[PDB]
Amino acid sequence: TSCETEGSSISFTVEKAGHVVRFNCPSTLEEIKPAYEAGDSTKVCTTADCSNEAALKDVLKSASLAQAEGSSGGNDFTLTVDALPEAETSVFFLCQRTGADKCGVHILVKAAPQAPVCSAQDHTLELQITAANSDTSFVCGGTFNVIKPANAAKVLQDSCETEVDLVSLVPHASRSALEQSGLIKLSVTDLPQQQQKLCYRCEDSSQKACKVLVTVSAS
Numbered sequence: 001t002s003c004e005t006e007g008s009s010i011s012f013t014v015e016k017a018g019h020v021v022r023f024n025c026p027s028t029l030e031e032i033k034p035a036y037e038a039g040d041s042t043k044v045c046t047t048a049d050c051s052n053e054a055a056l057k058d059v060l061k062s063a064s065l066a067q068a069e070g071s072s073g074g075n076d077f078t079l080t081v082d083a084l085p086e087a088e089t090s091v092f093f094l095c096q097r098t099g100a101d102k103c104g105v106h107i108l109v110k111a112a113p114q115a116p117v118c119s120a121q122d123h124t125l126e127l128q129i130t131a132a133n134s135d136t137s138f139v140c141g142g143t144f145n146v147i148k149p150a151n152a153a154k155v156l157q158d159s160c161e162t163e164v165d166l167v168s169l170v171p172h173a174s175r176s177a178l179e180q181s182g183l184i185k186l187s188v189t190d191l192p193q194q195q196q197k198l199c200y201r202c203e204d205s206s207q208k209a210c211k212v213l214v215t216v217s218a219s
Contacts (some may be wrong), residue, residue: 002026002072003095003103009048011106018134020080021107025095029103030074033094036067045092048104060085060109084112115183117141118202118210124158125210127186130217135187140202144210145182148201152176160199160211169196170216184212191219 002024003010012021025032033050034043042056042065056063062082070076079091093105118125119142127136140147149155152175155166166173173188186198196216201209 003029003105005103006101007103009104009106011108014079014081014084014107014109016110017084017112018080018082018131020078022076022078023093023105024070024074024076025103026070026072026074028074029095029097030070031096031098031100032067032075032077033096033100033102036065036075036077038067039064045094046090048092048106050092050094056091059089059091063109079107081109084110087111115139118212119144120210121204121208123210125212127212127214128217129186129188129191129214132188132190132219135185136214137183137185138200138202138212139182140184140210141182143204144202144208146203146205147177147182147184148203148209156199156201158197158199158211158213160201160209160213166198169198173216175200186214188216191217194218 004026014021034053040057043053044056044059046052046054056065060081064080066078068076088111089109091107094102096102115137116125117139125138129136149163153166154163157164170188170192172190176185195218198214200212203209
């Protein structure tokens with residue numbers, strides 16, 4: 001929690017999307033470096049000594065840094081990372097005296113785990129959406145590289161053979177694809193009023209399929 005010790009360092013890890021780290025610059029070394037600014041204006045250090053800096057937004061696309069009054073006091077900071085970065089990445093701060101003998105904060109943000117693969121006939125890959133404002137991702141891999149329905153607005157309704165509009169089951173949900181990698185992403189904002197089960201097919205050229213079933217939790 002608190003960066004108490006002059007000349008020392010504290011560290012933390014964000015290991016899952018949506019996880020948070022809180023640390024404290026105490027009343028004795030109350031001032032954070034880079035100087036705190038909220039939302040799009042936040043800056044982080046990119047070396048431990050804080051001789052190097054960048055915008056948080058250029059280091060971690062979906063992170064935020066919050067500030068609140070401290071406990072043995074000073075200031076509390078909360079970093080949330082919504083989506084993990086592609087590669088492992090470190091951010092840094094110092095706690096120092098106002099107006100500036102300093103204490104260092106090192107935060108490691110793990111690389112996003114790579115997406116589960118549906119690469120074998122008649123297997124079912126079972127995925128879950130349980131919170132608002134989340135996504136789940138999978139790859140149509142191996143020889144099962146054709147996403148079905150091909151049309152991103154469409155989804156299949158666990159027998160997986162009837163096509164319907166995705167927003168006919170989960171209003172506001174959308175499907176997106178990184179076609180060079182086979183990666184498909186299902187995203188939702190608000191949860192549907194009743195639990196749904198979405199199905200997609202990762203098919204080979206002969207239309208055999210690995211099946212992907214997403215349970216979307218009720219609001």
